[PDB]
Amino acid sequence: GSHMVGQLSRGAIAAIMQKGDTNIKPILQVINIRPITTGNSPPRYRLLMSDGLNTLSSFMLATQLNPLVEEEQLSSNCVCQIHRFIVNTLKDGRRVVILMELEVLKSAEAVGVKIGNPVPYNE
Ligand SMILES: O=C(O)c1cc(-c2ccc(CNC(=O)c3ccc(-c4ccc(C(=O)O)o4)cc3Cl)cc2)n(-c2ccc(Cl)c(Cl)c2)n1
């Protein structure tokens, strides 16, 4: 309904990347999903997600959840609650967030637009 950004967990992205908070179950919007280059293994999906204030592209989907993308329940504009995630830090210092359990609260078709005016999160 009205005040759409109020439907998203504003500040959750900073909390994940700054505080290292993994107990929260934030509500985020999917902005984009694309496959990464994989090879001889199951496909892997990378997501640009929004908390209403920030976007962050460092999300990857657990392979067990691939059917959500491939059957189109999880797609651009949908609003999701993250029930379980883990953070991994690469050798170069970048962090990636692996989404392990995810619930779609509102379908892409029921939302239909990017909520608010989130800006890219910096490191
Ligand atoms: O081609 C490409 O375009 C491509 C490639 C990559 C890529 C980069 C790093 C890695 C290293 N691997 C992991 O950080 C990892 C750790 C645990 C798990 C896991 C635990 C349980 C499960 C499960 O149940 O599925 O998965 C998964 C991963 Cl993928 C891999 C790819 N990237 C990429 C670059 C920069 C960012 Cl910020 C991101 Cl998000 C992705 N792009």
From Swiss-Prot:
Glycyl lysine isopeptide (Lys-Gly) (interchain with G-Cter in ubiquitin) crosslink, residue number(s): K25, K91
Protein's UniProt name: Replication protein A 70 kDa DNA-binding subunit
Family to which this protein belongs: Belongs to the replication factor A protein 1 family.
Annotated disease: Pulmonary fibrosis, and/or bone marrow failure syndrome, telomere-related, 6: An autosomal dominant disease associated with shortened telomeres. Pulmonary fibrosis is the most common manifestation. Other manifestations include aplastic anemia due to bone marrow failure, hepatic fibrosis, and increased cancer risk, particularly myelodysplastic syndrome and acute myeloid leukemia. Phenotype, age at onset, and severity are determined by telomere length.
Subcellular location: Nucleus; Nucleus, PML body
Highest taxon of the lineage: Eukaryota
Post-translational modification as stated in the protein's UniProt record: DNA damage-induced 'Lys-63'-linked polyubiquitination by PRPF19 mediates ATRIP recruitment to the RPA complex at sites of DNA damage and activation of ATR. Ubiquitinated by RFWD3 at stalled replication forks in response to DNA damage: ubiquitination by RFWD3 does not lead to degradation by the proteasome and promotes removal of the RPA complex from stalled replication forks, promoting homologous recombination. Sumoylation promotes recruitment of RAD51 to the DNA damage foci to initiate DNA repair through homologous recombination. Desumoylated by SENP6.
N-acetylmethionine modification, residue list: M4
Residues making up the signal peptide according to the UniProt record: none
Subunit field text: Component of the canonical replication protein A complex (RPA), a heterotrimer composed of RPA1, RPA2 and RPA3. Also a component of the aRPA, the alternative replication protein A complex, a trimeric complex similar to the replication protein A complex/RPA but where RPA1 and RPA3 are associated with RPA4 instead of RPA2. The DNA-binding activity may reside exclusively on the RPA1 subunit. Interacts with PRPF19; the PRP19-CDC5L complex is recruited to the sites of DNA repair where it ubiquitinates the replication protein A complex (RPA). Interacts with RIPK1.
From-to range in the entire protein, with total length: 1 to 120 of 616
Function in brief: As part of the heterotrimeric replication protein A complex (RPA/RP-A), binds and stabilizes single-stranded DNA intermediates that form during DNA replication or upon DNA stress. It prevents their reannealing and in parallel, recruits and activates different proteins and complexes involved in DNA metabolism. Thereby, it plays an essential role both in DNA replication and the cellular response to DNA damage. In the cellular response to DNA damage, the RPA complex controls DNA repair and DNA damage checkpoint activation.
